[PDB]
Amino acid sequence: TVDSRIPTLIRNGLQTKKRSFFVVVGDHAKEAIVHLYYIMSSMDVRQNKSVLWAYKKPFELFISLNDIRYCYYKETDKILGNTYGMCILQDFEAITPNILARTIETVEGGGLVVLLLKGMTSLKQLYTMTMDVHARYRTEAHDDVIARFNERFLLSLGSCESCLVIDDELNVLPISGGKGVKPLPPPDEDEELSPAAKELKKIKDELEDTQPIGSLIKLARTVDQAKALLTFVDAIAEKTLRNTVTLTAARGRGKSAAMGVAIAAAVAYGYSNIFITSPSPENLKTLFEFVFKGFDALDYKDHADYTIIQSTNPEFNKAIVRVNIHRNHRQTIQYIRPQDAHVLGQAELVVIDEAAAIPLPLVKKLMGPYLVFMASTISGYEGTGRSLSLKLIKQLREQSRSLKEITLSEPIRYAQGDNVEKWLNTLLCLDPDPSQCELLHVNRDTLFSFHPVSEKFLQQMVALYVASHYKNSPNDLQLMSDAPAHELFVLTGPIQEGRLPEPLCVIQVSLEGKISKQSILKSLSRGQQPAGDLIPWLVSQQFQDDEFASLSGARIVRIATNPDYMSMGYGSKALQLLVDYYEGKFADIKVRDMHELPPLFSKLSERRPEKLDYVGVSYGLTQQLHKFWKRAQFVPVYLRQTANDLTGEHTCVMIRPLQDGNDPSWLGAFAADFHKRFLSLLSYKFREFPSILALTIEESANAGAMLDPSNAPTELTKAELDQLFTPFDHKRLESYANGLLDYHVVLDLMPTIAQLYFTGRLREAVKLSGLQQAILLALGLQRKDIDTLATELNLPGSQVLAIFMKIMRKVTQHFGALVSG
Amino acid sequence: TVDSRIPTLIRNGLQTKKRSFFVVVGDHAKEAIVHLYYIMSSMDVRQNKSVLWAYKKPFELFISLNDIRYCYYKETDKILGNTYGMCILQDFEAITPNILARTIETVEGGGLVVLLLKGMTSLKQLYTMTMDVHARYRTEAHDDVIARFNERFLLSLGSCESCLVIDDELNVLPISGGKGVKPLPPPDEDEELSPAAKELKKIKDELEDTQPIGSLIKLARTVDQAKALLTFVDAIAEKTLRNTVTLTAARGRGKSAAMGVAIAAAVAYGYSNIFITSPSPENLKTLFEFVFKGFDALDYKDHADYTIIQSTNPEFNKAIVRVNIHRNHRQTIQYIRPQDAHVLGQAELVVIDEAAAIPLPLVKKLMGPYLVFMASTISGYEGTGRSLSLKLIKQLREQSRSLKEITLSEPIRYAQGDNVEKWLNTLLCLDPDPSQCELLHVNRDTLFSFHPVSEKFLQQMVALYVASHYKNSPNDLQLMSDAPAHELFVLTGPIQEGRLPEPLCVIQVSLEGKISKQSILKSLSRGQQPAGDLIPWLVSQQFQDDEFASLSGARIVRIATNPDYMSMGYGSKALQLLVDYYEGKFADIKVRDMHELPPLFSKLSERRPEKLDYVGVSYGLTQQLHKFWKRAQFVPVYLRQTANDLTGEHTCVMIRPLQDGNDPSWLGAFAADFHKRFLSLLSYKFREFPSILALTIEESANAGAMLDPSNAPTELTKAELDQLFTPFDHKRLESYANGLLDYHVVLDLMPTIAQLYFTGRLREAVKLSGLQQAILLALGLQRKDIDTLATELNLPGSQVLAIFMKIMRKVTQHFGALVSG
Ligand SMILES: CC(C)(COP(=O)(O)OP(=O)(O)OC[C@H]1O[C@@H](n2cnc3c(N)ncnc32)[C@@H](O)[C@@H]1OP(=O)(O)O)[C@@H](O)C(=O)NCCC(=O)NCCSCC(=O)Nc1ccn([C@@H]2O[C@H](CO)[C@H](O)[C@@H]2O)c(=O)n1
Ligand SMILES: CC(C)(COP(=O)(O)OP(=O)(O)OC[C@H]1O[C@@H](n2cnc3c(N)ncnc32)[C@@H](O)[C@@H]1OP(=O)(O)O)[C@@H](O)C(=O)NCCC(=O)NCCSCC(=O)Nc1ccn([C@@H]2O[C@H](CO)[C@H](O)[C@@H]2O)c(=O)n1
Ligand SMILES: Nc1ncnc2c1ncn2[C@@H]1O[C@H](COP(=O)(O)OP(=O)(O)O)[C@@H](O)[C@H]1O
Numbered sequence A, B: 001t002v003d004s005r006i007p008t009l010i011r012n013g014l015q016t017k018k019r020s021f022f023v024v025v026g027d028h029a030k031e032a033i034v035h036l037y038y039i040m041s042s043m044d045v046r047q048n049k050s051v052l053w054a055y056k057k058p059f060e061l062f063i064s065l066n067d068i069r070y071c072y073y074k075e076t077d078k079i080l081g082n083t084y085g086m087c088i089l090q091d092f093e094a095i096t097p098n099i100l101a102r103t104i105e106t107v108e109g110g111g112l113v114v115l116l117l118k119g120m121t122s123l124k125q126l127y128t129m130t131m132d133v134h135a136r137y138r139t140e141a142h143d144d145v146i147a148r149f150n151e152r153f154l155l156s157l158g159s160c161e162s163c164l165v166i167d168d169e170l171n172v173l174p175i176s177g178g179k180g181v182k183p184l185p186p187p188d189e190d191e192e193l194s195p196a197a198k199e200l201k202k203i204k205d206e207l208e209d210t211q212p213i214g215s216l217i218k219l220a221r222t223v224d225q226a227k228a229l230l231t232f233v234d235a236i237a238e239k240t241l242r243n244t245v246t247l248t249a250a251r252g253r254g255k256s257a258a259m260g261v262a263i264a265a266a267v268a269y270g271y272s273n274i275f276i277t278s279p280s281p282e283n284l285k286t287l288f289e290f291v292f293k294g295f296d297a298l299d300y301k302d303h304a305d306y307t308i309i310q311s312t313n314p315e316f317n318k319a320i321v322r323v324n325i326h327r328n329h330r331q332t333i334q335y336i337r338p339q340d341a342h343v344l345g346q347a348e349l350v351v352i353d354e355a356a357a358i359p360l361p362l363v364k365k366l367m368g369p370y371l372v373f374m375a376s377t378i379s380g381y382e383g384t385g386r387s388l389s390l391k392l393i394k395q396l397r398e399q400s401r402s403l404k405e406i407t408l409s410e411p412i413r414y415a416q417g418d419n420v421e422k423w424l425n426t427l428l429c430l431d432p433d434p435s436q437c438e439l440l441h442v443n444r445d446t447l448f449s450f451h452p453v454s455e456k457f458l459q460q461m462v463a464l465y466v467a468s469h470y471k472n473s474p475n476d477l478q479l480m481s482d483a484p485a486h487e488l489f490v491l492t493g494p495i496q497e498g499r500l501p502e503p504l505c506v507i508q509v510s511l512e513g514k515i516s517k518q519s520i521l522k523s524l525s526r527g528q529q530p531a532g533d534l535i536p537w538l539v540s541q542q543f544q545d546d547e548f549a550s551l552s553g554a555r556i557v558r559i560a561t562n563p564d565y566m567s568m569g570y571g572s573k574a575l576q577l578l579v580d581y582y583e584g585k586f587a588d589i590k591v592r593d594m595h596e597l598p599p600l601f602s603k604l605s606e607r608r609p610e611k612l613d614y615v616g617v618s619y620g621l622t623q624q625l626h627k628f629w630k631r632a633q634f635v636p637v638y639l640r641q642t643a644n645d646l647t648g649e650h651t652c653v654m655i656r657p658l659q660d661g662n663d664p665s666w667l668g669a670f671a672a673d674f675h676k677r678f679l680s681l682l683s684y685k686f687r688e689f690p691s692i693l694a695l696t697i698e699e700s701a702n703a704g705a706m707l708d709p710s711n712a713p714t715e716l717t718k719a720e721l722d723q724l725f726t727p728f729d730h731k732r733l734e735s736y737a738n739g740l741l742d743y744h745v746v747l748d749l750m751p752t753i754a755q756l757y758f759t760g761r762l763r764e765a766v767k768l769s770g771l772q773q774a775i776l777l778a779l780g781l782q783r784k785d786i787d788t789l790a791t792e793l794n795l796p797g798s799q800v801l802a803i804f805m806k807i808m809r810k811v812t813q814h815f816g817a818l819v820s821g
């Protein structure tokens, strides 16, 4: 006698085409799943689909009757863009937030989601379970890890109306939030149909006569997708290259699939040069899948009218790089990286999938005097921050000849308003004068306790620091929840009682350091790296130092303010409060844990700070971001040569010696060493730096070198000048300074003069303005051509020569005076 | 009573459609020309065309009745691709060989060519005329200039059968070679027509039905041009991109015009991406002229089916850069420079006009997996050497899927076998064991005396040294003929009597130097440059030296061997003979000058050489050419940073101190100064040099610095090493040498280590192989990326790191031993 709730929930999910959720507890879950599949199959025959099964590393007879796909947790990326009738998760030890999102969105509506839990006497042991991720965050300085994600995961099962926590012998648990589910009325679909379906049938048959719309539009499944297809084709049909269509929606809405049909329409419309740009070739798996689907709807013949060129040479062997069409005249569909903007000088259509993830300058150069298609993801898994989307939307409007924007709401695989989708979005959190503001430390125990007040703030703070991420990674939530030493700080204004304060800025601080001299020397003699810390474990390796790792410090993992209050002062003010705080300036029912709840908003005054020596931040170098860090008295110590592939910017590490009463000389050695490294390294992979940006780093690094008085530079004597330049070199300089010689001859002297000036030897003798320093820096250490410098400075080439010659007569006169005197 | 020869010659030229030549002598030539035009017009009405007139800086009534175009001698390039019924040259002072060719080829068949000569008592004063060109060759060391081109010009008038040296009062001179011209038989063209015309009419009407050939083929004027059109279109019609058509002919044959119709055919055939590459946009004036002519034959409508985009922004405002076609789908015709090979990744047709003038590597990268059209000029004005054409033809055959070659012979504007064309080609000369060979000095007085034996050798030697010129410049003949100090040397084998020796190698040596210390200081204090000499006038300016210009030397203006005997030894052997020779090791009838003729083949033994200090050569740097010069014991002194636009290579100057018994130390200072300049300048515009090529220059320059013993480098002491690297830098080096650190960290030390090695400080301490030196040179002084180095060396990137790490453990151990010891 099976319980009647399981058949009731299964029928409810199938009738409305919304996913159902189940969790099995026990060591004999094989009996449960086969009974679950029996109920699902005995009530409907349209669900005999693939049963996705994921593990890290009778039932025997039944597994040989239905299609089962076994996919590894690390290999779950291969099932992207697919559809399965049931998702199964077996090993709890490896279901990260990223994996949970990936294996859930690939389930069709009306299916089942079943999660396998190992044999348990009671469910109270799940909150303290070990994982495969706390093993990452273990450090010798901070080892103990408190598991909080499992606490939130088990408490959130009650907030899902389609979740049934089933048992080994088919029994329901009180923690399940769907125990009170009532059966739906019997379906009546013989004549009555959903209004969206009637609207979808209306638009399909209305344009059936017209071609190529009549054949392509049958591929659409939603009204929102269909309206995008007409919007795309309408731009194509005008045969005018002054259009631009921007599409934004969530993940799983069909923007990429609708993008492919738009491209297939353009091919049939007589378009020769078609280009696709995307952050990764992986994102084009579905886009190129529906181009062929659209081609099949157009009755194109394989190996006769089109060919598929697969770029199997690189690691992404499955990626499609080019498709050639030779029906009447040779038409082509080429996939290029966003950086390759030179090929687009002859194009007619550019499709930019996931344009939000592309850096804004790349999109700016990608768009030209042709037709551009754009798609973006604003919510859901792998979403984008609201700030970058706003920047992209505003930028396109400035360029506007015609721009049209559309949106998609209804999903494809599951009905809108899905219960499991809402539960997962909530679980992963996918979607005043500064002087009066005060910083508050957020207690992580109450924050992730799934309390209604706690949950509301968690959504606000999560959306605060993911508002600028190029891609939304849910694994960061696992990081904050289960970190051993990460502390969360929020800056709020003066807020009255009864109203939760609005987070104006969120700072995540990780405690780093306390490295024993044995541990550093053990691994500095090898190539292995625990990578528990970043700032102490990099400066020690980069500088081959032994004392810095022994210090104790903090790493600013993430700092973000509200996008509405940007450039107002709520970020710098939070940093100063955080800096002063570390300076010691402030002296089987499983209900939510109502007890053991400390004040969520524990003020900094009532908590004693730790004794810290420095604060460090590792961040992607940008001119605006660097200016903010330098304002907070940070000095660079490191700057990675290999620019990040996704963003195109170099990682920069800054360290501030916040502790007062301590020697500011251990950092003076680090800043000086980097400063002398930067000058010589300005020609290796730093040649692409703008002159102004590279100058600012040099000034900041030089300022940091002044923390140590022993690093003060000495003047240049006459004896040193003679050792550096032969009399032939001097006579060349005098003639050029008089305007009697071309500048090309005196060009080998750039490294000598520029190094002398920027190392401080010539800095006090001759004073140069901001513009002259930038030209000398580029010509001397970046080895930039004059024409390249003229373009970058937005100045004529002759004017650059005039400024450069001004630099010489200042240097030439001092050199002559030094030798003569 | 006018003489009957002028009407007879005019009728002869008109009937056969060959140009006629006249020369007028006197101060009242206006009476002669108007009588000449009267005879021309009174006998035919199809000659009332434009009368081109060129000057540097009644008749009044008659000039207002006919079209006259006045063009400046320097501005004669604007009449390129035009057609005129009569060419007039007035000022003898500026009719250079280049100008003479330019103003002659633009005359239609049957027209007149009249050259105006100022009033003369006798013609004997023409041989000694000053010009506007000898003013260039005047030098303070060598001032007197003997005019020989005018001597050859006046003697060659007798070798032209259509040249009548007319007088002021219509009288003929004995020097004229057409005084015995007999009248042609009366024409019979009512029914009888030339066989070429019948063949031309046959091919036009045969393909009249077929389109787009039927309309385009009417543009052809010769059978050879027509056969090219069918050859071009046949490649287009196959719709297969595995074809390549190479066209070679003389200048004025119609290769460019036939190229345009081929492009217009491709547009009508459904070709979207069409690209044109040429050395200069000027060469495309006629090609783009006939594309529109072909478009008009296709009845394309301006501003409705095609648009003309003119690149007026640069200096070549008349150049057409792009043409867009939007009849059915957007088709385009884009003009790109040969260097821009990245855009061709999507193309369907590439037209390479004047492919011979393009460097071979550029053509190699221009051709890809598409259809390529090629045209070249092999003879006539602005021709190309036989060596480069052979290199291009062979290279294409190696790449062969299908290749077809065609040729054109019959001209367009004038009938084949034109008398004036043959006279001009002759006038401008447009078209054994080495141990047994001996060098011979060619006497310039007899060489340019127009003697039948002398003329035959002149054609062989001219074709010898223009066999490698990218473009054929006839002004060089004016240089050799009227130079004040240039001496011509030819190397011949042992040849029996009665047979003129075959020139195996020709060397043109210009005597340079003897600059007073006042003259150098006068202009070294200013920016003006007489530019009479090159090697003494550049080393003095580049090095700010005062003694080198006072020396006496020789410049090897041009050295070329027979293309059949290349890489055999006839060039190096001639150089050694020339070097030893300067070392003093060898103790109104105007007939051709039969008297005053020295031995044309005066041996070096019977002529006393001049006391010389050095021999210098200015040449375009190539790896093969540099190896030959270094073998002859030459050392570089200069290397221009700005690569030549046409060829893409940098000018290099080498100097050899051939004089024995003299101090080889004045050059040791020059070579050492360049060697220290090259190391620092390897990052400014020399970054494009291959590692092997840049290494060879460094070795050669370093070897030259050894001529001065005082320039020998000293060893590196322990004190110097500590001054260069801080203990942090040393500890970084030890860790990397052990394989305990990434190579990116130890990268700022490249300029320090590479400079130390290549300056000689570390050269004797540590020995590096040829491959290791090249990697260290590029990574240290060229700042090349590893991936760039891996591609250039045709080696995997990991292997480059392995070799680079080998370089360190040699340097690291010496540094440790130096400090420890
Ligand atoms: C706005 C803000 C800076 C200050 O906020 P404020 O508004 O409060 O500025 P304030 O008024 O105080 O001073 C005024 C002065 O600030 C300046 N300023 C004004 N506006 C801007 C501006 N828009 N940008 C910059 N500077 C600005 C200046 O212009 C002005 O000078 P001015 O005064 O006269 O005008 C800060 O709060 C904020 O939200 N930044 C956005 C989030 C962020 O990135 N924070 C830094 C994180 S570091 C550790 C870290 O994790 N790094 C990473 C990052 C990514 N990745 C990977 O890449 C992927 C995603 O990228 C992937 O996810 C992965 O993660 C990674 O691996 N590691
Ligand atoms: C062939 C030749 C070198 C030796 O002749 P050989 O056959 O005899 O060589 P040999 O047997 O003695 O030694 C064997 C060794 O020679 C080597 N070697 C073997 N074959 C080659 C090879 N094909 N090329 C190179 N090196 C080779 C080596 O590979 C082998 O080593 P290996 O041994 O084991 O194998 C010489 O004779 C010759 O024709 N060179 C062609 C004409 C030329 O350019 N001469 C130099 C002129 S400099 C002053 C000057 O005016 N410069 C310019 C030039 C242009 N421009 C502007 O650019 C426009 C036009 O460009 C425009 O017109 C304007 O003018 C300008 O402004 N200024
Ligand atoms: N018109 C359609 N017809 C059928 N399936 C579709 C359609 N549109 C989307 N899908 C489903 O959605 C998946 C594609 O993901 P999609 O939502 O297009 O990515 P994105 O979120 O980038 O738009 C495919 O696996 C497919 O099953």
Ligand SMILES: Nc1ncnc2c1ncn2[C@@H]1O[C@H](COP(=O)(O)OP(=O)(O)O)[C@@H](O)[C@H]1O
Residues within 6 Å of the ligand: B081, B082, B083, B219, B220, B221, B225, B250, B251, B252, B253, B254, B255, B256, B257, B258, B286, B412, B413
């Ligand atoms: N098919 C043609 N019809 C008329 N004129 C032509 C034709 N072909 C060549 N010409 C004449 O030749 C000139 C073009 O020079 P051309 O010989 O094509 O240059 P290239 O020597 O590079 O082929 C034009 O001025 C034109 O008058």
